[PDB]
Design an enzyme around this catalytic site. Structure first.
Site, PDB file in Angstrom:
ATOM      1  N   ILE A  33      72.491 -75.322  12.674  1.00 46.90           N
ATOM      2  CA  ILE A  33      71.937 -76.396  13.497  1.00 46.90           C
ATOM      3  C   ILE A  33      70.879 -77.268  12.778  1.00 46.90           C
ATOM      4  O   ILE A  33      70.683 -78.434  13.124  1.00 46.90           O
ATOM      5  CB  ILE A  33      71.327 -75.831  14.834  1.00 46.90           C
ATOM      6  CG1 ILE A  33      70.907 -76.959  15.729  1.00 46.90           C
ATOM      7  CG2 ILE A  33      70.124 -74.903  14.610  1.00 46.90           C
ATOM      8  CD1 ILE A  33      71.977 -77.472  16.534  1.00 46.90           C
ATOM      9  N   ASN A  88      67.729 -63.218   5.497  1.00 43.02           N
ATOM     10  CA  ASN A  88      66.280 -63.100   5.743  1.00 43.02           C
ATOM     11  C   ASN A  88      66.069 -61.838   6.543  1.00 43.02           C
ATOM     12  O   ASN A  88      66.769 -61.614   7.549  1.00 43.02           O
ATOM     13  CB  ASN A  88      65.805 -64.292   6.537  1.00 43.02           C
ATOM     14  CG  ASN A  88      65.830 -65.575   5.718  1.00 43.02           C
ATOM     15  OD1 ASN A  88      65.884 -65.573   4.505  1.00 43.02           O
ATOM     16  ND2 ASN A  88      65.839 -66.703   6.418  1.00 43.02           N
ATOM     17  N   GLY A  94      61.429 -64.603   6.863  1.00 41.60           N
ATOM     18  CA  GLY A  94      61.682 -65.799   7.641  1.00 41.60           C
ATOM     19  C   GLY A  94      62.728 -65.600   8.729  1.00 41.60           C
ATOM     20  O   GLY A  94      63.292 -66.628   9.222  1.00 41.60           O
ATOM     21  N   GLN A  95      62.985 -64.370   9.123  1.00 39.19           N
ATOM     22  CA  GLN A  95      64.034 -64.154  10.167  1.00 39.19           C
ATOM     23  C   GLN A  95      63.344 -64.397  11.544  1.00 39.19           C
ATOM     24  O   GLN A  95      62.283 -63.845  11.843  1.00 39.19           O
ATOM     25  CB  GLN A  95      64.425 -62.665  10.112  1.00 39.19           C
ATOM     26  CG  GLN A  95      65.521 -62.350  11.140  1.00 39.19           C
ATOM     27  CD  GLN A  95      66.054 -60.934  11.039  1.00 39.19           C
ATOM     28  OE1 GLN A  95      65.528 -60.082  10.336  1.00 39.19           O
ATOM     29  NE2 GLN A  95      67.121 -60.711  11.740  1.00 39.19           N
ATOM     30  N   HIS A 101      72.331 -62.467   9.950  1.00 38.53           N
ATOM     31  CA  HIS A 101      73.032 -63.715   9.680  1.00 38.53           C
ATOM     32  C   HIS A 101      72.903 -64.027   8.185  1.00 38.53           C
ATOM     33  O   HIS A 101      71.800 -63.969   7.610  1.00 38.53           O
ATOM     34  CB  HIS A 101      72.575 -64.918  10.531  1.00 38.53           C
ATOM     35  CG  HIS A 101      71.113 -65.111  10.670  1.00 38.53           C
ATOM     36  ND1 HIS A 101      70.326 -64.241  11.361  1.00 38.53           N
ATOM     37  CD2 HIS A 101      70.304 -66.176  10.356  1.00 38.53           C
ATOM     38  CE1 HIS A 101      69.068 -64.727  11.432  1.00 38.53           C
ATOM     39  NE2 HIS A 101      69.024 -65.896  10.807  1.00 38.53           N
TER      40      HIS A 101
END
Lengths: 115, 115
Positions: A33, A88, A94-95, A101
């Site tokens: 996105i 991540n 940074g998750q 994913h």
């Protein structure tokens, strides 16, 4: 619930659409996105593993399958000069969404350090 | 040759030492020579796969094993707040050494984009 209780669970259950580029019985790939490169997509397992530090030894084949799906989808999208794959883990990684994913980024030179 | 014909083949064959933190029958993990975070190490397969786009379907379990080794070594090194895993493919990905290598980076907040 099949697909888990995050944003990604609604994508897996097809409750909310996504820009799906690859789907099998194990995994889904779809455009991110908030793209950070001309091609930037995610590969996720249909099974809800919260983060890579929660993956178990019996998940190895599924984790590797995410990389093979990423290779296949990158080829379908015409990457020829390569790409970077990123997972991540936790806050320092940074998750934000706690479902595994794999990012696949390409279509530009990727820099260093990787964040 | 077992371990292949790159810089990493000499590490796998123990011809040249490295800062080895984990070793099994499938993989080796060792600190990266040019660290970009307070913890930065590589996980490599002992089998010579040139790049992720050359991995075959039967390599899935081994590719996932690199992630599980990275999780285990990150735990041994005391990461508690997470980490980022990175695989570079080809020129745009930033790969220079043509033997698959997974980076694991942590001990600081990792930024975005990931390069």
């Amino acid at each position: 619930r099949p697909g888990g209780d995050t944003i990604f669970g609604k994508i897996i259950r097809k409750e909310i659409p996504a820009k799906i580029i690859f789907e099998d019985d194990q995994a889904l790939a779809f455009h991110d996105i908030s793209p950070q490169a001309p091609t930037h997509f995610l590969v996720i397992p249909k099974k809800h593993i919260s983060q890579i530090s929660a993956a178990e030894d019996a998940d190895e084949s599924l984790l590797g399958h995410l990389m093979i799906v990423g290779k296949k989808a990158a080829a379908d999208l015409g990457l020829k000069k390569g790409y970077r794959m990123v997972v991540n883990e936790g806050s320092d990684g940074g998750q934000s969404v706690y479902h595994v994913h794999l990012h696949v980024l390409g279509g530009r030179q990727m820099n260093w350090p990787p964040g």
